[PDB]
Amino acid sequence: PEWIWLALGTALMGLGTLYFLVKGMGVSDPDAKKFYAITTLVPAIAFTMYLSMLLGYGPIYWARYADWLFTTPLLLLDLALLVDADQGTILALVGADGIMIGTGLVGALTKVYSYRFVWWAISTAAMLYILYVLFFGFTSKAESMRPEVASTFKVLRNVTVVLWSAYPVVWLIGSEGAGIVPLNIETLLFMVLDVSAKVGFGLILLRSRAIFGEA
Amino acid sequence: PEWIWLALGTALMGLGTLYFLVKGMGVSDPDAKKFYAITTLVPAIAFTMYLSMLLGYGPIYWARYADWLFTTPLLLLDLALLVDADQGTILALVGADGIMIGTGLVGALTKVYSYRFVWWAISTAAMLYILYVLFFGFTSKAESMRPEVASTFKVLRNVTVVLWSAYPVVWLIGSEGAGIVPLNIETLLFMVLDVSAKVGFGLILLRSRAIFGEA
Amino acid sequence: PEWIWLALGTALMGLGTLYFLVKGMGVSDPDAKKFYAITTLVPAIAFTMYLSMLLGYGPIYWARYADWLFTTPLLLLDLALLVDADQGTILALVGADGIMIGTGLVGALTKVYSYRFVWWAISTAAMLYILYVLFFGFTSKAESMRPEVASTFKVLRNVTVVLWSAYPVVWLIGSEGAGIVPLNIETLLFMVLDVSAKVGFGLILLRSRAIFGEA
Ligand SMILES: *C/C=C(C)/C=C/C=C(C)/C=C/C1=C(C)CCCC1(C)C
Numbered sequence: 249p250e251w252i253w254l255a256l257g258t259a260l261m262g263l264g265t266l267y268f269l270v271k272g273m274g275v276s277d278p279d280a281k282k283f284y285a286i287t288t289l290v291p292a293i294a295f296t297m298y299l300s301m302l303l304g305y306g307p308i309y310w311a312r313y314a315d316w317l318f319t320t321p322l323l324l325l326d327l328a329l330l331v332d333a334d335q336g337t338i339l340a341l342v343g344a345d346g347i348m349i350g351t352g353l354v355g356a357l358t359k360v361y362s363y364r365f366v367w368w369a370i371s372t373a374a375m376l377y378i379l380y381v382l383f384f385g386f387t388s389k390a391e392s393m394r395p396e397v398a399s400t401f402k403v404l405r406n407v408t409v410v411l412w413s414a415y416p417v418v419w420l421i422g423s424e425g426a427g428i429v430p431l432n433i434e435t436l437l438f439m440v441l442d443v444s445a446k447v448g449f450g451l452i453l454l455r456s457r458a459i460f461g462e463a
Numbered sequence: 464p465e466w467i468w469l470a471l472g473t474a475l476m477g478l479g480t481l482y483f484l485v486k487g488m489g490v491s492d493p494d495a496k497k498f499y500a501i502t503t504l505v506p507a508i509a510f511t512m513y514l515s516m517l518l519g520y521g522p523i524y525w526a527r528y529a530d531w532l533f534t535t536p537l538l539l540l541d542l543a544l545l546v547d548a549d550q551g552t553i554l555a556l557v558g559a560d561g562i563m564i565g566t567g568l569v570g571a572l573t574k575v576y577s578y579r580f581v582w583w584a585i586s587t588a589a590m591l592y593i594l595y596v597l598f599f600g601f602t603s604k605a606e607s608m609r610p611e612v613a614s615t616f617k618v619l620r621n622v623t624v625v626l627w628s629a630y631p632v633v634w635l636i637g638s639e640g641a642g643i644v645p646l647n648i649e650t651l652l653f654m655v656l657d658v659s660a661k662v663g664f665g666l667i668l669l670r671s672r673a674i675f676g677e678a
Numbered sequence: 679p680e681w682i683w684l685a686l687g688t689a690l691m692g693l694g695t696l697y698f699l700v701k702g703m704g705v706s707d708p709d710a711k712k713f714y715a716i717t718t719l720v721p722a723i724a725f726t727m728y729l730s731m732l733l734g735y736g737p738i739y740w741a742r743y744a745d746w747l748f749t750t751p752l753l754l755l756d757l758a759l760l761v762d763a764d765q766g767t768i769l770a771l772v773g774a775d776g777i778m779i780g781t782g783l784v785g786a787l788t789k790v791y792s793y794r795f796v797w798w799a800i801s802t803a804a805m806l807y808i809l810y811v812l813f814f815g816f817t818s819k820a821e822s823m824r825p826e827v828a829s830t831f832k833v834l835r836n837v838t839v840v841l842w843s844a845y846p847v848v849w850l851i852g853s854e855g856a857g858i859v860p861l862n863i864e865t866l867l868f869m870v871l872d873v874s875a876k877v878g879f880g881l882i883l884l885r886s887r888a889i890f891g892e893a
């Protein structure tokens with residue numbers, strides 16, 4: 249049953265945003281304030297999205313794609329700011345991201361596997377672009393920061409590249425591809441990916457000192 | 464009849480944007496330019512929104528929520544810039560705001576009062592968050608500005624906290640709550656709130672000297 | 679037949695984004711990076727939009743307006759950054775732009791010519807506002823830049839004011855106005871306008887030295 253997977257997701261996202269809110273209450277360093285604000289909004293949004301999916305009962309799920317659409321940009325912003333990335337490259341990441349999600353929604357809404365295949369390819373190309381920049385460009389840029397920031401980025405980088413790559417694969421084994429995995433399980437896996445990519449990521453970032461200004 | 468309430472709203476928003484446009488024509492100070500641009504766009508958008516509601520004849524009103532969705536962020540930006548608020552806190556205000564409106568639209572589109580109640584609660588929590596930051600954080604921040612800017616902010620702060628709080632209450636006495644107030648009146652009250660919160664706010668801000676750079 | 683007009687558009691937008699991507703691969707100057715990122719995203723988005731129109735077969739076209747909605751803002755950003763335009767004026771351009779497109783979509787979705795006429799007027803007023811600022815304000819601002827940047831802007835300015843003005847006229851001879859031009863031709867003309875206003879504009883900008891920082 250999906251309701252219990254959607255119930256838990258709603259819970260963990262809600263708990264994570266609450267916890268993030270508590271830990272950030274007494275933060276004066278403006279650098280940290282941005283990270284807290286950015287990072288707390290991500291899971292705050294997924295929260296409302298999962299709640300709508302939970303109350304939704306009574307395939308295709310717009311809430312699932314809207315969540316991704318609004319939250320992925322903030323996630324990259326976190327990484328961007330952490331490494332003091334250039335505005336152009338930041339703008340390129342978000343645009344590529346917006347394309348990755350929008351394009352993936354069209355595929356989901358398409359019937360002809362052939363067509364869906366094209367949308368899937370464009371989406372994955374967009375994701376690979378984003379990951380490429382995260383793994384390489386950002387790592388080099390992160391090399392000019394104090395070790396504390398460099399190492400925190402590396403962890404977030406690894407977790408992000410890995411977790412993000414699993415989405416199209418989970419999407420592939422679901423109903424839009426090799427129909428191996430039933431709906432409830434598909435919902436579960438995406439839930440695990442969503443909590444980890446948002447709350448997991450947030451814990452890693454908001455617990456480190458990296459969110460604090462340097463010199 | 465709602466048409467005459469929707470007709471007036473269209474008129475006042477249109478007149479306000481026209482007036483704002485005239486007063487800003489000869490402005491060189493870049494600080495003032497931002498305030499004029501920001502402030503003039505708010506009522507320019509509501510204008511087109513009310514016009515669609517007026518021509519719409521021939522409940523539920525998407526134009527009403529889209530107006531709020533696009534304009535509330537700019538309104539907070541005005542206050543944010545006036546007090547030189549931090550980027551993180553600005554980003555947190557807009558996100559909370561986006562959540563407040565989106566969440567309120569889902570409630571409006573929900574049938575089960577129970578469900579609608581939850582959406583209402585999340586929305587009001589988001590608004591209270593925004594107001595909390597406006598009344599306290601911004602006031603402290605406003606304390607570091609010349610008296611002219613400090614006092615103009617206080618007025619906008621008061622008018623905003625008061626006017627904004629009336630929305631959920633008006634929403635409550637309408638058809639989604641205690642069905643005490645009929646449709647035409649509901650439309651009227653929201654119109655009065657919209658004109659005051661946009662044109663009223665604009666007059667207060669664009670007439671003061673606060674919009675001008677300091678040192 | 680529209681498919682071949684929509685097929686070519688998909689091709690030219692795709693080729694342009696590919697070419698833009700190649701030329702920008704080895705760019706370190708952050709000034710140039712922004713221009714490449716901004717400029718490459720515009721045609722990358724139109725690409726996916728035209729592809730959906732092409733695969734769409736199997737009037738009214740949302741993809742056509744969404745393309746414009748998401749891409750016109752970036753186009754103005756290019757011009758804005760090139761002339762180091764003020765934030766307020768940038769914010770005013772995008773808002774006016776968002777209004778121009780949204781308002782034009784409502785007109786297209788309206789049946790009563792009379793109503794459609796009003797939407798058309800508001801949209802054209804918004805465009806004239808944008809052009810007015812581009813031709814005058816930006817030109818003056820461009821006068822404070824080295825001749826290389828001044829002259830590149832002038833060309834983009836001319837091409838933009840001319841190409842953009844042709845849209846409402848093409849819209850006028852189509853089915854929402856003087857039904858002189860059939861659908862396939864209408865689609866063709868808009869395609870020519872889209873490729874020129876995006877790829878054409880991009881070639882002009884990304885080939886010049888203007889995208890490089892100065893002092
Ligand atoms: C909080 C949510 C996160 C981090 C979501 C990330 C999502 C992706 C990387 C999704 C990618 C997809 C493709 C590459 C193609 C197939 C469809 C998608 C949308 C699942």
Ligand SMILES: *C/C=C(C)/C=C/C=C(C)/C=C/C1=C(C)CCCC1(C)C
Binds near residue numbers: 563587
């Ligand atoms: C120009 C429009 C303005 C200033 C609108 C402000 C709107 C709000 C503060 C709306 C709040 C609502 C709730 C808190 C819950 C119930 C539903 C809403 C959307 C009316």
Ligand SMILES: *C/C=C(C)/C=C/C=C(C)/C=C/C1=C(C)CCCC1(C)C
Binds near residue numbers: 779802843872
């Ligand atoms: C890449 C696309 C570009 C540059 C599109 C530009 C579009 C316009 C200037 C459209 C204007 C319109 C009006 C002024 C009124 C009638 C309807 C429109 C949307 C065609």
